[PDB]
């Protein structure tokens, strides 16, 4: 899922997990005890919270995530580093 939704619902868990609405707490606490993810779940509304995870490749040879995040970030911090230079133009003097 294309993040920025990490604290979320439970019906997609009870739908894709082929589990019920009730048995998601066993699910999340046992999955934390396994050791593939380490985020302490917001349990009051069955709201997920996640950490480090193991990947299975992105867009078909990692086109889209790589471009629109990696190179977007490249030109982000690169060009705003040029802006750091632009305001720090002669503070080296």
């Amino acid at each position: 899922r294309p993040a920025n939704h990490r604290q979320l619902t439970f019906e997609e868990i009870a739908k894709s997990a082929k589990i019920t609405v009730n048995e998601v707490e066993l699910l999340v606490m046992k999955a934390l005890s396994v050791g593939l993810v380490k985020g302490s779940i917001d349990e009051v509304d069955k709201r997920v919270h996640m950490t480090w995870v193991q990947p299975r490749v992105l867009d078909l040879q990692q086109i889209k995530g790589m471009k629109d995040r990696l190179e977007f970030w490249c030109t982000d911090v690169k060009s705003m580093e040029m802006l750091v230079e632009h305001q720090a133009h002669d503070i080296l003097t």
Binding site: E25, M29, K30, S40
Partner: protein, 304 residues
């Protein structure tokens, strides 16, 4: 031997202990006689009379090395002394001194009940470091893991398997039925005495273990859903969590007006390690990504 003794016969022998220690040279006759007043003062029902005379017992050291297993066989009598009046860390050295007579006896009955009496007391021991390595020292027996209750017992030992308590009550209430071996099940479970407090100690352990692992695994949680997921009731969690706050070693937080309760850090007083974690930890791994992705660039540019 007259009337099989009483307290007044024991009152004779207790003043007839402190004189008969240091006259001659002796090692063994006082031990194989010293059993007699301790099985007296256990039947004098006091148990602090037993601990006074235990303060008389313990002052004689170098009690190993008695030849031809002569006081290694007395270790059944010394544990017969220290059975009741020993607390749940006394039972650790107690139930590892139980092993010394079946150590060389090989004994597929009394060493088999040495197996069960050495397996059925780790949960009885409180949450401590000695639990944390005694679970690795019960790791090392050969025919104890033939007992599936050892598998259940090691299964209780790492997040305890988020379960229903009564299923484990099935699996460990079969043990009073199990075999000719019944005395470890008597000492732990088949007692209408301290063993019933060991039942309630297992109750203590299961709700306390829900605290132990779930106090890591808490961000926000309702009150009554907790109370029914503690293998127990809702309003009974008043007392059943007042004990876990006179436990006083977990800083916690509850709300009764809305039920949203929470065990967590003391409410973000220091915001730094968010910045430190992300920037230093992950982004210094990212400035290492330069240092080792040029290395992996060299890896792929072996064949490029």
């Amino acid at each position: 031997k007259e009337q099989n003794g009483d307290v007044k016969e024991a009152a004779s022998i207790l003043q007839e202990l402190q004189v008969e220690t240091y006259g001659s040279m002796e090692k063994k006759e006082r031990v194989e006689f010293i059993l007699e007043q301790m099985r007296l003062c256990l039947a004098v029902k006091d148990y602090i009379r037993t601990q006074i005379i235990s303060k008389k017992i313990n002052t004689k050291f170098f009690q190993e090395e008695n030849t031809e297993k002569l006081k290694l066989k007395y270790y059944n009598l010394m544990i017969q002394l220290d059975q009741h009046e020993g607390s749940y860390l006394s039972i650790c050295k107690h139930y590892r001194a139980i092993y010394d007579t079946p150590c060389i006896q090989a004994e597929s009955e009394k060493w088999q009940q040495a197996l069960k009496s050495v397996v059925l007391y780790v949960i009885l021991a409180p949450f401590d470091n000695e639990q944390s390595d005694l679970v690795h020292r019960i790791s090392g027996d050969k025919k104890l893991e033939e007992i599936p209750k050892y598998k259940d017992l090691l299964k209780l030992f790492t997040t305890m398997e988020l379960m229903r308590w009564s299923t484990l009550v099935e699996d460990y209430g079969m043990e009073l039925r199990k075999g000719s071996l019944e005395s470890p099940a008597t000492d732990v479970f088949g007692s209408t005495e301290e063993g019933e407090k060991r039942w309630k100690d297992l109750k203590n352990r299961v709700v306390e273990h829900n605290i132990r692992i779930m106090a890591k695994y808490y961000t926000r949680i309702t009150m009554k859903r907790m109370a029914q997921l503690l293998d127990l009731s809702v309003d009974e969690s008043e007392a059943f969590l007042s004990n876990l706050v006179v436990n006083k070693t977990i800083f916690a937080k509850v709300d009764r007006l809305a039920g949203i309760i929470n065990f967590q850090r003391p409410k973000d007083p220091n915001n730094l390690l968010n910045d430190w974690s992300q920037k230093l930890n992950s982004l210094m791994s990212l400035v290492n990504k330069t240092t080792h992705l040029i290395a992996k660039e060299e890896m792929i540019h072996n064949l490029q």
